[PDB]
Design a protein around this ligand. Structure first.
Ligand SMILES: O=C1C[C@H]2CCCN2C(=O)c2cncc(c2)/C=C/CCCCCOC(=O)[C@@H](Cc2ccc(Cl)cc2)N1
Ligand SMILES: O=C1C[C@H]2CCCN2C(=O)c2cncc(c2)/C=C/CCCCCOC(=O)[C@@H](Cc2ccc(Cl)cc2)N1
Lengths: 306, 306
């Protein structure tokens, strides 16, 4: 028993992390086979960041302008190209520790593990959700750009996030590994703001199921509701609409516990209206929304990798 | 900016995890040089667990009774011995992935990363603290025994915890890597209870410093207090006594922020007395006590390893 914010083991991803230096700028790169992936803003001076012409700035660079270091070993750059906001540095050496991998674009509400890196070396690992407003609530300092987010999907490292920037509100913005930003953000030092954020409703229900599995039952009532009546209450407290798709993916946790999804919706409805009655759920005084239904299954089943 | 519950990268420890089978029992082992470390209760039947004599039980075992698997490869056992509650299996092969390592016995309030494992394979990584009552609030299922807790101290993996059991309250008990239990617990299916748990006062103060560093500052007053006056208030809320040793360890965060330790104690005193008034600190409605003073420095300075 017990329930913690749990990250994927980081070893497979640690083996891919490299240092990319261009001019006086150093950040992190992802080394997969004979290509290194990093944010294209590595090629910018502070002045370039104000209004960058990336097509022109990339053409003006030669392969010799890029210093790539895998630990203490220098990797010779033999080619440079752009895919959207990601720089691709072709090198003369394939990474022998390249895991079986995919590039995937995740939906708002989906979680992933972040390996926070500086100078191509890991600092630590933590769990993040893609927020409904397409930001993430990270822990990232100057030099963290090119740190990646991932899941392990059976036998495959699914890379879903590369870190690009921090908004003045202190939340984080980045791209998939095809270099396409999550949300309406751009890799230039212009005034940008995230939309109003909402609570991930399907994730709150998943976490209440996790609490029942671990023996917490005080919040369970004898009531049930409809999806429509739940959603009328949900919208008032800045919760995302629960869809029929959400009810289906909670099915496994409903099966495990024998508590119908719409019974747990009635319990959540009472918690939102009347509060937590001076009590905690899994060591929290607030309703947690950064566990997906499958995050609960993986932790409470003891799913392993390799 | 941002502050998250952050674990060490798990890769160095992943390279040391093996599967240990004795009869119909399989759990996890730690492979360092030519020794595999695991809980001695691996040699017990469910019947033996009720009233084990480990000295007699181990006499009855041969080297051949231990199946050690490093992935798909069997490691031949050439010796077995007991050190307190830890079994040491000498094998014919030294682990080529052995990092620089120390065995350390940690104090109550000290934090560490857990690599939770099943069948010698990793499930996930999370951060824990040694509680004042010598339990840990883990996430552990059947098959998790031999999972280890660690810190990375410069370029050295400091192993501090091996997992042995779950108490009926749903908290966890285990040993250092010399096999000495934290707290008054034994590896036998006997009636056992942890002492009443207390809040780790020095850790709460460290987390308030982390909040100021990230710009969360509403809880700061310019009240003064003495250590003795603070402790008279603190003890009433089931907080550990704060010593002058504790005041010194917060010194670095006081230096960074320019808020004196006893000024932050005055602010904590007000939060205890008056509550949070429906506000949050780093997205929490309760006072967090599982960040050490150095955990704050590591995360906010971007410490990396090797
Ligand atoms: O995003 C950052 C910087 C980031 C990007 C270049 C290098 N960078 C990091 O190395 C870094 C990564 N992650 C976290 C941090 C720093 C923390 C910073 C603290 C102060 C933040 C104050 C508000 O910053 C901003 O609005 C944008 C403004 C901005 C947006 C886009 C670009 Cl192309 C350049 C600047 N600046
Ligand atoms: O500690 C466990 C079992 C643990 C030890 C053998 C294998 N073990 C795990 O594989 C395991 C590790 N960690 C978490 C779990 C299981 C979770 C279990 C859910 C039920 C918990 C109900 C309460 O269990 C107990 O009091 C003691 C009773 C007990 C105490 C000491 C011993 Cl030497 C044997 C049994 N049993």
């Amino acid at each position: 028993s017990g329930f913690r914010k749990m990250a994927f083991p980081s070893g497979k991803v640690e083996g891919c992390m490299v240092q990319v230096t261009c001019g006086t700028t150093t950040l992190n790169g992802l080394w997969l086979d004979d290509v290194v992936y990093c944010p294209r803003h590595v090629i910018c001076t502070s002045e370039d960041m104000l209004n960058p012409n990336y097509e022109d700035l990339l053409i003006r660079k030669s392969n010799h302008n890029f210093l790539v270091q895998a630990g203490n070993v220098q990797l010779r750059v033999i080619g440079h190209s752009m895919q959207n906001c990601v720089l691709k540095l072709k090198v003369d050496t394939a990474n022998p520790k390249t895991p079986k991998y995919k590039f995937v674009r995740i939906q708002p509400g989906q979680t992933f593990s972040v390996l926070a890196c500086y100078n191509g070396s890991p600092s630590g690992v933590y769990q993040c959700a893609m927020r409904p407003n397409f930001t993430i609530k990270g822990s990232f300092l100057n030099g963290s750009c090119g740190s990646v987010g991932f899941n392990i999907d059976y036998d495959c490292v699914s890379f879903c996030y590369m870190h690009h920037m921090e908004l003045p509100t202190g939340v984080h913005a980045g791209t998939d590994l095809e270099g396409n930003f999550y949300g309406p953000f751009v890799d230039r030092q212009t005034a940008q703001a995230a939309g109003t954020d909402t609570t991930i409703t399907v994730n709150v229900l998943a976490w209440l199921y996790a609490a029942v599995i671990n023996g917490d039952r005080w919040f369970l009532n004898r009531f049930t509701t409809t999806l429509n009546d739940f959603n009328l209450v949900a919208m008032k407290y800045n919760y995302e609409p629960l869809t029929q798709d959400h009810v289906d993916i909670l099915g496994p946790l409903s099966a495990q516990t024998g508590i119908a999804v719409l019974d747990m919706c009635a319990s959540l409805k009472e918690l939102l209206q009347n509060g937590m009655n001076g009590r905690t759920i899994l060591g929290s005084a607030l309703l947690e929304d950064e566990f997906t239904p499958f995050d609960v299954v993986r932790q409470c089943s003891g799913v392993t990798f390799q």
